[PDB]
């Protein structure tokens, strides 16, 4: 089989910049190499076939080249509708093999997150369960860390989840969950969500609530 490698895997560029995607085959594939664009929640779509043929309807800012074992996809000027993952495809021989893929991230100005904490719902309780929620939204860059602390003590029975870069402001949002039994939720008082945005601020961001209430 022909093994396809792509590089780099991640790529951050400012809108308008020149971007270059690399793809290396492990055997000469001659001219048979394709590129597909796959946006979030969509089926891959054909961008270019046989190292350099644009397909119908694709913008001229795209071009391909290279030959034999090294190929390149180049975007002259990065548009925000070009944020996506990119796939390389070798098809001289069966089985046809795809490359590992490259993800493009539009770059922007730092942004500190809006943090928000939610105590359990009276309903979830009425069933002896209790999830505390912390929505950590619209931040940039992606690096960040959240910590839960019950009565000042760091804790762990947590669940995190980060979205993908938002198509509207290029930020990232994160959701962290702290699940406890009703009983344990009740034998404590001050729940806390502390986020540290390695950037935006030093004093870190804390949001809490007293179960008995302030």
């Amino acid at each position: 089989d022909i093994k396809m490698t792509q590089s780099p895997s991640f790529l951050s560029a400012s809108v308008g910049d020149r971007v270059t995607l690399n793809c290396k085959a492990s055997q000469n594939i001659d001219k048979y190499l394709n590129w597909y664009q796959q946006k979030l929640g969509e089926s891959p779509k054909l961008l270019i076939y046989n190292t350099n043929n644009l397909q119908t309807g694709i913008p001229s800012r795209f071009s391909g080249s290279g030959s034999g074992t090294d190929f390149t996809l180049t975007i002259s000027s990065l548009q925000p509708e070009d944020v996506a993952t990119y796939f390389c495809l070798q098809h001289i021989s069966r089985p046809r093999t795809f490359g590992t893929g490259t993800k493009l991230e539009l770059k922007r100005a730092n942004a500190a997150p809006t943090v928000s904490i939610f105590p359990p719902s009276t309903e979830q309780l009425a069933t002896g369960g209790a999830s505390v929620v912390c929505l950590m939204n619209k931040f940039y860059p992606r690096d960040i860390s959240v910590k839960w602390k019950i009565d000042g003590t760091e804790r762990n029975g947590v669940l995190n989840s980060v979205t993908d870069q938002d198509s509207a402001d290029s930020t990232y949002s994160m959701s962290s969950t702290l699940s406890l039994t009703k009983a344990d939720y009740q034998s404590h008082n001050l729940y806390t969500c502390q986020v540290v945005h390695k950037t935006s601020s030093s004093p870190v961001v804390a949001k809490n609530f007293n179960r008995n209430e302030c």
């Binding site: 891959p44 054909l46 495809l89 069966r94 719902s121 979830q124 669940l159 989840s161 979205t163 699940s179």
Partner: protein
């Protein structure tokens, strides 16, 4: 060209067999090769096999990685293509796409939207939905963020919308997470005129024909 549509179940237990079907609208089905490509969440596509022209005799080739277990067939009489999978294993869990091969612009000039096939012996269980309103003596600005906890459900996916799409303003639906065999997910929205307006999240789980409207 116009359209390629896949259909075919999603939750299946290990060892079982399954049949996905792909329908093609807007072009002479019979004059093209047709492919099945699959993609495990968080990874590149993987080519499965294809069935040839009417001219090449409708023969089939398969990626050795699966061969023996998967078979491909057409029903030229009604533009359908089929992928028959046998001895489904856990790693066969993925989104499966049929893709026309094409002439010149090829391979894969047109894909279908895909269908997820989940292979596991867990069971179809609906979600519990809890509203998330700002709590215990918490200040809050004029724009308040609210949310909905969609808990313990299986298998994916679920659908969350706000005020039946009417308030699609600042909405963030976070990717699911596997906590002990069940999916849990979160969704946030923003509203100025918080209280006096009414915000409701609409959750839906098809694998259980569940449609819930929790008001916050």
């Amino acid at each position: 060209e116009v359209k390629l549509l896949e259909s075919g179940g999603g939750l299946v237990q290990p060892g079982g067999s399954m049949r996905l079907s792909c329908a093609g609208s807007g072009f002479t089905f019979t004059d093209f090769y047709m492919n099945w490509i699959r993609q495990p969440a968080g990874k590149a596509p993987e080519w499965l096999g294809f069935i040839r022209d009417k001219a090449k005799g409708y023969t089939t080739e398969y990626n050795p990685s699966v061969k023996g277990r998967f078979t491909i067939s057409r029903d030229n009489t009604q533009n359908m293509l089929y992928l028959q999978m046998n001895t489904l294993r856990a790693e066969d869990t993925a989104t499966y796409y049929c893709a026309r091969e094409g002439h010149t612009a090829a391979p894969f000039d047109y894909w279908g939207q895909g269908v997820m096939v989940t292979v596991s012996s867990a069971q179809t269980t609906a979600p519990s939905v809890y509203p998330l309103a700002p709590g215990c003596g918490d200040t809050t600005s004029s724009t308040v963020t609210l949310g909905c906890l969609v808990k313990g459900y299986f298998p994916e996916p679920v659908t969350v919308t706000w005020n039946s799409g009417a308030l699609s303003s600042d909405v963030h639906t976070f990717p699911a997470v596997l906590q002990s065999g069940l999916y849990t997910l979160t969704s946030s929205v923003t509203s100025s005129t918080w209280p006096s307006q009414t915000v409701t999240c609409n959750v839906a789980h098809p694998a259980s024909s569940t449609k819930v409207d929790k008001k916050v």
